[PDB]
Each structure stands twice: as structure tokens, then as C-alpha cells.
């Protein structure tokens, strides 16, 4: 039986096997259709397939709500190459084409197998007629909500349009619903299940955050009389893990300020570890230079703002050290996780000072209240704040670092085996926190 899945995956989409074991399970449980389904994988862990493929293997049509026209086009083009008759009804569509597709959707055996559609379109009463005749003939095998996170106000990109989708799902009792996003805290997940009226049990396929080979720890800048030297020592332990090869691989140090990058890259260089500053302040050429130097391991350490790491794809990144705490636990996972891509053991470390925290907490309250004066009030302004607080907690609390990150993102207790300062030495991390008290 499962072969028709493998068969179509290969014969249509031209991959022999799935991208990850979870993609297989997700797609396979969408196939059965006995449960509604949530898929939460980072962009490009192959979420599209988890519905694009079952859509072809199902009796009737598969309708896909995607929030932007931009996103729809990308997929239509790709599906058209796979010789799939995929249609899109949106804002952008031509007066004649609109009426010509509507006619197609009315035919017994409509040419369309997969209909992509704006949430705007889905609510518009001008469309409800087409919807009803399809609902009537029970010609819906699957409803799919892409970018499910737009239903939540705690999401980064709430679209009111998406609130109406849940009522529609209930009208489509016949068919299972598939909901997908990359980004969902547990509060966003429950918001996604509630406001879409998904039918329990919901099978959830959620790419966990935990990575076996990464050792997270936190050091408290205020406890360290030679901080620049402590960072140097750290960078070298991490790079120095092939005694015969000397410096194997490279690492990143993340800073807030462009100033601090320039300054720190220097302090590190002089203290032993060759390092170059990267940030949007530099000339396009000087950047591509510093990247390339870092890339070919000519200069193994790069001190950068959140500019850097965007599509780097350097595998052997042995350390990611945050000189300044990050604006969000979101940001810290993304930043730190550029480490150890090749899967060889790596070190993520966060330099916490209360002095840093206060600066940032201040700057978020400014940038937020500045937003509330320009665009008025929002609920995602609280997620913005609580997102930072979660990371401060991570530093100010005793307890497994991977667990702490798993908690925030809604991942199951992770299999951390002496893979974080706390689990390795719970007492010494207590000793170090007890100490931060006395500073102030």
C-alpha cells in the first residue's frame, strides 16, 4: 500500500525518499485522512509535499489557503512543471480568467486538482456560490491552511482574514484539514487548533529544536575579570578540537552594536584569535571580503550583528558565542544554531550581563511604544516582550538549557546528555548564579 506514496513521490515530484522521517509521517498521516493535522517544520523541511502529494492521491479537489499572492505564484509555477493542473483564484486574477476558472470548477470532473486561494478571496461572498456547489457534491478531499500562524494575535503576522477560516472548516465536515507553519509557540498552536475548529485528535508533526551535538552554556560577564580573554580561551577550546590539524573549522561571535563588533574582533585578534568584524555598516565589497576570508577559514572567527548567517551554509561552525544577549529566544535559537551544521560536536555560549539585559529590555520597550504611537496598539507587542523575557529566564534560571529552549518552542523534553552546563554540572551553575546575586 505505502508504495503508491513512494511511487507518486518519485513518479510526479522526482524524489526517491522523503526529506526527513517526520515529513514521511506527516505526509503519510495526511494520506490516511482519518485525523486533522498540524505540520510545523522550518521553511524548506518540505511542508508543501505533506499536502501537495496526498492532494493528487485523493478522490476530489484539495483547497489551499495561502495568505499572500507572492507565496501562491511560486508553488503554482513549480506544480505546473510537475504537469499538475493546479489553479489559483486571487485578487490579482484577470476578469475573463476569473470567470473562465469559475466555469471549470462547476464541471463534473473539473480540470483543477489543487486550488490555491487568498483568505480575502475565501471570505468574499462573490465566491461562496462556487464553494457551496463544491461542498454540496462533496468535491473537497482536503482543506489546507498554509501559514496557519496568521490566525493567532501572539503570532508575528496576525491576519484577521484567517479568523473566518475556522467556521469554513466546520462547514466542510466531510474532509480532513491540514494546517502548516514554520513558526508556532504553544500559545500560537492552541490558537491555531481553536480558531480553525480542527477535529481532535489532531496529529502534530513538529520538527523539534534540540540538536544532539550542541553544548549550550551561559557565562555571566559580571563574574569574569578577563572577559575578552575568557572569550578567546573559549573560541580556541572550540576550534582546537583536532590537536594535529591545529585550528579546525571556524566560529561566530554575535554582538548588538556595530561598534562592539569592530571593537571585539580587534580585542580577540590581539589576544590570540584572528577575527574580522561583519555588519551592514561596512562597504558591500569589504563584507563579501570578510565573508570570503571567514568562508575559506583564512580568518576563522567573525564578529557580527544579525546581518550575518543569512544563507551562509558553512558546515564546520564549531562555536556561536553571543557577546550581547539576543532580542528574542527565537533569535538566539536561529543565531546559536548556525553552529555544528556538519554534526561534529560544537559549542553555543551566551555572555549574560544584567547591564546588557537592561539596555535591550529598554530598547524593546522604546521600539514597541514607538510602534504603538505610529500604528496603534497590538497583541504581538506582548509576544515581542515575552519572547525576550523567555531568554533572560534561560540565563537567570538553573535547569537544562535544551529543555528551556524546548519548553519555549513547544518541543518534548529533549534527550540532552551532559549537553548543557546545568545537566553536566548543576551545582557549579548554582554556584555561578548565587554569585550573580552578590554583584548587585
Amino acid at each position: 500500500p505505502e508504495r503508491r506514496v513512494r511511487s507518486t513521490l518519485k513518479k510526479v515530484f522526482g524524489f526517491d525518499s522523503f526529506k526527513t522521517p517526520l515529513q514521511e509521517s506527516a505526509t503519510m498521516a495526511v494520506v490516511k485522512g482519518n485525523k486533522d493535522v498540524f505540520v510545523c517544520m522550518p521553511t524548506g523541511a518540505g511542508k508543501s509535499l505533506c499536502y501537495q502529494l496526498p492532494a493528487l492521491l485523493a478522490k476530489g479537489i484539495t483547497i489551499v489557503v495561502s495568505p499572500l499572492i507572492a507565496l501562491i505564484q511560486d508553488q503554482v509555477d513549480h506544480l505546473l512543471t510537475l504537469k499538475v493542473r493546479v489553479s489559483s483564484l486571487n485578487s490579482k486574477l484577470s476578469a475573463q480568467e476569473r470567470k473562465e476558472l469559475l466555469a471549470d470548477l462547476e464541471r463534473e470532473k473539473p480540470q483543477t486538482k489543487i486550488l490555491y486561494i487568498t483568505p480575502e478571496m475565501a471570505a468574499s461572498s462573490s465566491f461562496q456560490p462556487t464553494l457551496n456547489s463544491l461542498v454540496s457534491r462533496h468535491l473537497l478531499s482536503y482543506l489546507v491552511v498554509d501559514e496557519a500562524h496568521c490566525v493567532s494575535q501572539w503570532g508575528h503576522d496576525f491576519r484577521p482574514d484567517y479568523l473566518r477560516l475556522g467556521a469554513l472548516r466546520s462547514r466542510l465536515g466531510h474532509a480532513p484539514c491540514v494546517a502548516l507553519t514554520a513558526t508556532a509557540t504553544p500559545q500560537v498552536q492552541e490558537d491555531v487548533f481553536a480558531a480553525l475548529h480542527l477535529k481532535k485528535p489532531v496529529a502534530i508533526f513538529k520538527t523539534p529544536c534540540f540538536r544532539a551535538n550542541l553544548f549550550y552554556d551561559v557565562q555571566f560577564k559580571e563574574l569574569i575579570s578577563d572577559p575578552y580573554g575568557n572569550l578567546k580561551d573559549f573560541c580556541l577550546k572550540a576550534l582546537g578540537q583536532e590537536a594535529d590539524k591545529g585550528l579546525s573549522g571556524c566560529g561566530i561571535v554575535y554582538c548588538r552594536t556595530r561598534e562592539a563588533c569592530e571593537q571585539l574582533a580587534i580585542e580577540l585578534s590581539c589576544r590570540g584569535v584572528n577575527a574580522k568584524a561583519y555588519h551592514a555598516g561596512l562597504k558591500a565589497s569589504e563584507r563579501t571580503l570578510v565573508q570570503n576570508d571567514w568562508m575559506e577559514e583564512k580568518v576563522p572567527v567573525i564578529v557580527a550583528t544579525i546581518s550575518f548567517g543569512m544563507g551562509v551554509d558553512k558546515a564546520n561552525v564549531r562555536f556561536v558565542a553571543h557577546w550581547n544577549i539576543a532580542k528574542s529566544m527565537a533569535g538566539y535559537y536561529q543565531e546559536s544554531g548556525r553552529a555544528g551544521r556538519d554534526g561534529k560536536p560544537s559549542w553555543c555560549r551566551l555572555y549574560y550581563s544584567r547591564n546588557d539585559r537592561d539596555q535591550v529590555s529598554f530598547l524593546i520597550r522604546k521600539e514597541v511604544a514607538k510602534l504603538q504611537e505610529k500604528r496603534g496598539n497590538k497583541a504581538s507587542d506582548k509576544a515581542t516582550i515575552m519572547a525576550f523575557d523567555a531568554l533572560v529566564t534561560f540565563c537567570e534560571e538553573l535547569g537544562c538549557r535544551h529543555a528551556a529552549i524546548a519548553k519555549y518552542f513547544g518541543d518534548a523534553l529533549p534527550a540532552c546528555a551532559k549537553g548543557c552546563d546545568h545537566c553536566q554540572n548543576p551545582t557549579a551553575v548554582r554556584r555561578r548564579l548565587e554569585a550573580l546575586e552578590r554583584s548587585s
Partner: nanobody
Amino acid sequence: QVQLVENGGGCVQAGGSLKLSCAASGSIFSINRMTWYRQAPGKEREWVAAITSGGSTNYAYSVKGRFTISRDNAKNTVYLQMNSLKPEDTAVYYCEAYGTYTLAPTGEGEYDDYWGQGTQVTVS
């Protein structure tokens, strides 16, 4: 799937107290709400009390000020302290875990509601 197990039921002289419990076992991350219900023989099920994540409580008027709903969220175990028991309180008390989020380290996980067998309360 998840085992809801009630405990602490019994007979008491009216005016007495009981303390009922609800252990949810399984790969549980969080539960939207746990609600205590009572069903007397051939009588409609009655909503007694509810606790959400963050300890937001909600109680029926029939019981407000006699009943107290606690949670050791560490033990994922909710309690109903029942003081001043009346014979009208006699029924089968059971919890529902509403919005129950299980997950595996693998990323496979289930959001479902889950219902206990019950425990008998009887008041002379």
C-alpha cells in the same frame, strides 16, 4: 494516548469532606483545562469546577465556597477539595483533560481531549 485516573472517593456523613485526585499519565506537554464533572445514576452530567494553565479557576454555583480545585502541575495531578458534603453531591466524579498536547522527542504529537473512568462519592 493518556490515562486519567481519579482517586479519593468514598462514603461520608453529610457535612464531611473528601479530596478527589486526577493523575494524567503519558507524554503530556500541557492541558488547556481540566474539568471535574459529576453524574448521578440516570441524571444529566453536571459541570463542577475547572482549572486552566495559569491556575484560572471556574466553579458551579451549587458548590462555590465548598469546593476548591488545585493542581500539582509538576505531577500533572489536579485535586478537588470537597468540604461541607451534602447528600445532593452524591454522584460519579470524573475529570476531562480539555486541549491535551502530547509530543514525542521525535516531533510526532497528539492534541486531543481525554476522560477519566470516575470515582464514586456518596453522602449519607
